[PDB]
């Protein structure tokens, strides 16, 4: 009924953010909407000031994220976390001019042993088409990463392309099956939702608005 | 000339399970208030269709599927030498009503019969069409003018010319509707059957047997009445306008198959490879089944087979004399039986009967 | 009320002869024609006429086999365990129209068809819940069976 | 060169303690309105399989089980000198679809037939893949390319090539599906076993029937093309050898301790073998249940012969055919080469119907 | 918390003809519980919450008069609510006052049957979510308000 694009986000370390104005940079357990929009953005070489392109992207695309557990030699490996005592010396003291602090400190959280399968699709008011997105994910223009730039991908961003009625149905065709799914679209049997502050307010730089995921447990 | 060929068959099977339902139970049916074991028409049709005798004497069966991707690849591999690949792909797309990417899962909306020869011919027409910058809708308009030249392709798809086809999309939705020429009934036993039940196990060669739980498989034996008829006019039409001779040919092959072919279900383990004990073929203006001969369930004496055949004969007398049926009739029977009314030509062998059919019931 | 897990445990530990002898019935009331039945269900209050019909149903289903119905306790989180309809739907072996024709099937037609479904699906389920359902077995418990089946099938897809 | 070979057998043995159901009763079946005693084809097959004749003339029989742990132990003991334990475990794991640890119990989905020679071959391919840096996925992929190489190992598991195998998990789902070559029916008596008597009317009047013996019709056919394929492409000669051992076993074996009633005197009661293009069974010769004369055997042979004549003539069967029966019944008219002993029949099968 | 009426409406409008056909065969609201297609229809709309079941059963039942028997129309921006059921029934010109009389005096179940007949007969144009609220409560007050709206409408128009 609808055509989906299927991506895999997998690497030794990932980081998907939560509200902070502080030096500790938190992570949640799966990709944020903002972040996925950012990933696609990087693929479609969109500069940071290009509010038109950013808005087009945001209004065109929607995501569903599945949390894939890792299995090594027939054993399950749970997603764990990591805190990096991250230091900066010679950091700007102010936005104007060149005075700087001897040392500042930050704490940054990462996800270890995490892997995701993402399904994205187009909205009825789409400015784009899926062929574009596929081409981009296969040949990105800006460097693609998993949250932070220090976080490479260990598997091609492109997984596949297909067609179904649910996101759930779409994702069924792609191993590993069995993980939880967080979708921007409702799936009939399922009633639980999960609140986040993912949604980028493109008109207002680096500020995010509340939204809700639909949860499809496995 | 009579338009309808009636085929009646009496075939007795040894213990078996030739057709079952969603829960592994023999298909039955109630007739005359008693339970008969039943073999569905579909099961028969497909048994004939995929049979060796069909492959040798009739041709290639159609290819029924819903997976347009797999079908695509098949078409490429089998037609690639005669057509360019996206001629092929575009043909498949036009006929199906679905976009043929090189995605490797593309489903039609239902399982449908595909005849490769038909597809070939369409490929020609569309190659022709785009050498001529001709529009798809216009091509539709053209091909609709002469449907006979489309039906002529069903000589490489006789099963469909016999059993009809309907699609729900693509150009087939206006080009592919075939009204089947052969009407066939579910086979039912001429007598009541209470099925038997096999209580089975599976020995585990590595554990001490001990107490076990036993499975159960319903099974029975029985004398089945097969009926089918062929609308010669309709078959001729469905074959692009073939002669009555070719129709009588196919009809003959159907008689053979309906007298010899048995569904493959559970045969490796019950092996009821039985040949028919009676076959009667009757030409007519209005088709008519003889099922009512067994409305009063046949009761057994020295078996079910003899009484069944005599039942069939007596009813045939009644109906023939009653409705005034002056049509060619011939009967083949492995038993020497009480004499059916003499206006029916006895045949000592099946091939003699078949030659009698090929020759329009005069030989 | 009737102790369920007790009856289950008794059925699991019944002797295979009695067990096979019980399985052989083709209608719940035929259990009345069998001694092993009475010895089985007497500790659970067969002697009280209020509980009789119920027991007849329960055992009948159990008679599908010694290990056709697999009990599984409810998770402590969940308020109730896996009901019958969910189990059947989860089997993947049952067709919707079997369930539909089950709930529209007359006293008696009804239990026979259910047992056929049970053997075919070999369901894992919370047994005492099934037992309750069988204790009452009226229009709304049937309709609830259909509900759970349909809704689970839709959920899972 | 006909593709099917049909085996028709009349065998005379006890009608009791052969094949019972869940309730201590001998299996039976209704045919033509009368109750016949039945031996079930599973029982026949497994009786042949585990028979000594099979062990001495066909080979070792398949190892059918559902217990993967114990199969693990068996495969370790029996292959442990030829591969490292880890390669064995890997192989069983890839074929079954389950994890092979050292746990006490590991169950497959169903009781499956296993050939140890086949498993060994797979171990070879696995170890070779390990040395060749192949992941399991392209391993499966390349194995899919040459299946006959896998079927060659069924020459050590002929029962499987004969009666088939399905798998529900593991690599066996795509490499292990075997479509059986031999079709076999349930043995049914040609006659009614219940005494043909109304005891009420009988007490006023105060052929002869047998009771401690009964005549069974056994049918089987073998699809030679199929057997050749399942055996990894073996010759029609090897086919015919196996088919011959099946004619023997079918003609002689009785499940359990019991044996043919006349075991010590003749080698077989009646056997006919017939090549053809389409298999066809002769059971309908007994739809009308046979009535006794001097027992049931030669009226049964008479029925068999009369029906063979009528069917052969009617449907035009001019394939090769041979028959062994030392009863003087009215002869079978068609061109059916009579055979003085059983062995001569067996050699006639071994020679594709000409010797 | 509250039941989405418009969603259910559109859902019913876009339903496949077979399912609609299956639902159109009930002759009584509770029979909807015998029908798979129903549960599939109302699952998204909170069927699983016992609070909303009776309500939903009525809604669907009335909708089950036909695929477009109940024509929804939005209210005008000016007025606070749209067209009431009574008013629409009166506006149709096909409904006789005594019908409404016997409607509001009918026993449970029977009233819904009668109502559905009136809806097939009238093909009313009305504010559906309004009617939905009405069905959600459906008591003395609502029945009375129905007849009143009918009477006053028929009076002026």
Curated annotation (Swiss-Prot), chain A:
Gene3D superfamilies: 3.30.70.2660. This is CRISPR system Cascade subunit CasD. CDD domains: Cas5_I-E. One of its GO terms (molecular function) is DNA/RNA hybrid binding. One of its GO terms (biological process) is maintenance of CRISPR repeat elements. GO terms for cellular component: protein-containing complex. CRISPR (clustered regularly interspaced short palindromic repeat), is an adaptive immune system that provides protection against mobile genetic elements (viruses, transposable elements and conjugative plasmids). CRISPR clusters contain sequences complementary to antecedent mobile elements and target invading nucleic acids. CRISPR clusters are transcribed and processed into CRISPR RNA (crRNA). A component of Cascade, which participates in CRISPR interference, the third stage of CRISPR immunity. Cascade binds both crRNA and in a sequence-specific manner negatively supercoiled dsDNA target. This leads to the formation of an R-loop in which the crRNA binds the target DNA, displacing the noncomplementary strand. Cas3 is recruited to Cascade, nicks target DNA and then unwinds and cleaves the target, leading to DNA degradation and invader neutralization. CasCDE alone is also able to form R-loops. Belongs to the CRISPR-associated protein Cas5 family. Subtype I-E/Ecoli subfamily. Pfam families: Cas_Cas5d. It comes from Escherichia coli (strain K12). Keywords: Antiviral defense.
UniProtKB/Swiss-Prot annotation, chain B:
Keywords: Antiviral defense, RNA-binding. The lineage of its organism: Bacteria, Pseudomonadati, Pseudomonadota, Gammaproteobacteria, Enterobacterales. One of its GO terms (cellular component) is protein-containing complex. CRISPR (clustered regularly interspaced short palindromic repeat), is an adaptive immune system that provides protection against mobile genetic elements (viruses, transposable elements and conjugative plasmids). CRISPR clusters contain sequences complementary to antecedent mobile elements and target invading nucleic acids. CRISPR clusters are transcribed and processed into CRISPR RNA (crRNA). Coiled coil: none annotated. One of its GO terms (biological process) is CRISPR-cas system. This is CRISPR system Cascade subunit CasC. The gene is casC. Induction: Repressed by H-NS, activated by LeuO. Activated by the BaeSR two-component regulatory system, possibly due to envelope stress. Part of the casABCDE-ygbT-ygbF operon.
UniProtKB/Swiss-Prot annotation, chain C:
One of its GO terms (biological process) is CRISPR-cas system. It comes from the Bacteria. Keywords: Antiviral defense, RNA-binding. Induction: Repressed by H-NS, activated by LeuO. Activated by the BaeSR two-component regulatory system, possibly due to envelope stress. Part of the casABCDE-ygbT-ygbF operon. Disruption phenotype: Loss of resistance to bacteriophage lambda infection, loss of plasmid silencing. Increased levels of 57 nucleotide crRNA and also 2 and 3 spacer-repeat units. GO terms for molecular function: DNA binding; nucleic acid binding; RNA binding. CDD domains: Cse2_I-E. One of its GO terms (cellular component) is protein-containing complex. Belongs to the CRISPR-associated CasB/Cse2 family. This is CRISPR system Cascade subunit CasB. It comes from Escherichia coli (strain K12). The lineage of its organism: Bacteria, Pseudomonadati, Pseudomonadota, Gammaproteobacteria, Enterobacterales.
From Swiss-Prot, chain E:
Disruption phenotype: Loss of resistance to bacteriophage lambda infection, loss of plasmid silencing. Increased levels of 57 nucleotide crRNA and also 2 and 3 spacer-repeat units. GO terms for molecular function: DNA binding; nucleic acid binding; RNA binding. It comes from the Bacteria. Keywords: Antiviral defense, RNA-binding. The keyword RNA-binding applies. Induction: Repressed by H-NS, activated by LeuO. Activated by the BaeSR two-component regulatory system, possibly due to envelope stress. Part of the casABCDE-ygbT-ygbF operon. InterPro entries: CRISPR-assoc_prot_Cse2, Cse2_sf. One of its GO terms (biological process) is CRISPR-cas system. The keyword DNA-binding does not apply. GO terms for cellular component: protein-containing complex. Belongs to the CRISPR-associated CasB/Cse2 family. CRISPR (clustered regularly interspaced short palindromic repeat), is an adaptive immune system that provides protection against mobile genetic elements (viruses, transposable elements and conjugative plasmids). CRISPR clusters contain sequences complementary to antecedent mobile elements and target invading nucleic acids. CRISPR clusters are transcribed and processed into CRISPR RNA (crRNA). This is CRISPR system Cascade subunit CasB. It comes from Escherichia coli (strain K12).
């Amino acid at each position: 009924m609808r055509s989906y694009l299927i991506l895999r986000l997998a690497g030794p370390m990932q980081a998907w953010g939560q509200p902070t104005f502080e030096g500790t940079r938190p992570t949640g357990r799966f990709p944020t909407r903002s972040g996925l929009l950012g990933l696609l953005g990087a693929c479609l070489g969109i500069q940071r000031d290009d509010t038109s392109s950013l808005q087009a992207l945001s209004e065109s695309v929607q995501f569903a994220v599945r949390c894939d557990e890792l299995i090594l030699d027939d054993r399950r490996v749970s997603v764990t976390g990591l805190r990096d005592y991250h230091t900066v010396l010679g950091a700007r003291e102010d936005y104007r001019g060149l005075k700087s602090h001897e040392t500042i400190q930050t704490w940054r959280e990462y996800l270890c042993d995490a892997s995701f399968t993402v399904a994205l699709w187009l909205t009825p008011h789409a400015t784009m088409v899926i062929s574009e997105l596929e081409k981009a994910v296969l040949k990105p223009r800006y460097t693609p990463y998993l949250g932070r730039r220090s976080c490479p991908l260990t598997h091609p961003l492109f997984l596949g392309t297909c067609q179904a009625s649910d996101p759930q149905k779409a994702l069924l065709n792609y191993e590993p099956v069995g993980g939880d799914i967080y979708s921007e679209e409702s799936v009939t049997g399922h009633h639980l939702k999960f609140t986040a502050r993912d949604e980028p307010m493109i008109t207002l730089p680096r500020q995010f608005a509340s939204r809700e995921w639909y949860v499809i447990k496995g | 000339m009579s338009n309808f060929i009636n085929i009646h068959v009496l075939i007795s099977h040894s213990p078996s399970c030739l057709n079952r339902d969603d829960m592994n139970m023999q298909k039955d049916a109630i007739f005359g208030g008693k339970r008969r074991v039943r073999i569905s028409s579909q099961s028969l049709k497909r048994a004939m269709r995929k049979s060796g005798y069909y492959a040798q004497n009739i041709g290639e069966s159609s290819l029924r599927t819903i997976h347009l991707a797999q079908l695509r690849d098949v078409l490429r591999q089998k037609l690639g030498e005669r057509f360019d690949q996206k001629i092929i792909d575009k043909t498949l797309a036009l006929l199906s009503g679905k976009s043929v990417d090189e995605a490797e899962k593309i489903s039609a909306d239902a399982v449908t019969p595909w005849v490769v020869g038909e597809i070939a011919w369409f490929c020609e027409q569309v190659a022709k069409a785009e050498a001529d910058n001709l529009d798809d809708k216009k091509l539709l308009k053209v091909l609709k003018e002469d449907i006979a030249a489309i039906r002529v392709n069903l000589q490489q798809g006789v099963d469909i010319a016999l059993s009809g086809r309907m699609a729900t999309s693509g150009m087939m939705t206006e080009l592919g509707k075939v009204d089947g020429a052969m009407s066939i009934a579910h086979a039912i036993t001429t007598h009541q059957v209470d099925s038997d039940i096999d209580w089975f196990t599976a020995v585990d060669d590595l554990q001490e047997q001990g107490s076990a739980h036993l499975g159960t498989q319903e099974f029975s034996s029985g004398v089945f009445y097969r009926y089918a008829n062929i609308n010669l006019a309709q078959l001729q039409e469905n074959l692009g306008g073939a002669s009555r001779e070719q129709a009588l040919e196919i009809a003959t092959h159907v008689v053979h198959m309906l007298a010899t072919e048995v569904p493959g279900a559970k045969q490796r383990t019950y092996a009821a490879f039985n040949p028919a004990d009676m076959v009667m073929v009757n030409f007519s203006d209005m088709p008519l089944s003889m099922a009512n001969a067994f409305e009063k369930a046949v009761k057994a004496k020295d078996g079910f087979l003899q009484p069944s055949i005599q039942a069939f004969n007596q009813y045939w007398d009644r109906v023939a004399n009653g409705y005034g049926l002056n049509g060619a009739a011939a009967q083949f029977s492995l038993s020497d039986v009480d004499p059916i009314t003499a206006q029916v030509k006895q045949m000592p062998t099946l091939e003699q009967l078949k030659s009698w059919v090929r020759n329009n019931g005069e030989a | 009320e009737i102790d369920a897990m007790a009856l289950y445990r008794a059925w699991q530990q019944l002797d295979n002869g009695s067990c096979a002898q019980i399985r052989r019935v083709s209608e719940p009331d035929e259990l009345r024609d069998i001694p092993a039945f009475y010895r089985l269900v007497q500790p659970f209050g067969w002697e009280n006429p209020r509980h009789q019909q119920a027991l007849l149903r329960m055992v009948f289903c159990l008679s599908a086999g010694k290990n056709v119905i697999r009990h599984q306790d409810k998770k402590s989180e969940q308020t109730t365990g896996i009901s019958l309809g969910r189990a059947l739907a989860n089997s993947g072996r049952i067709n919707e129209r079997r369930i539909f024709q089950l709930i529209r099937a007359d006293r008696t037609a009804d239990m026979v068809q259910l047992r056929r479904l049970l053997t075919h699906a070999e369901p894992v389920l919370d047994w005492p819940l099934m037992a309750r359902m069988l204790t009452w077995w009226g229009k709304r418990e049937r309709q609830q069976l259909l509900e759970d089946f349909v809704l689970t099938t839709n959920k899972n897809a």
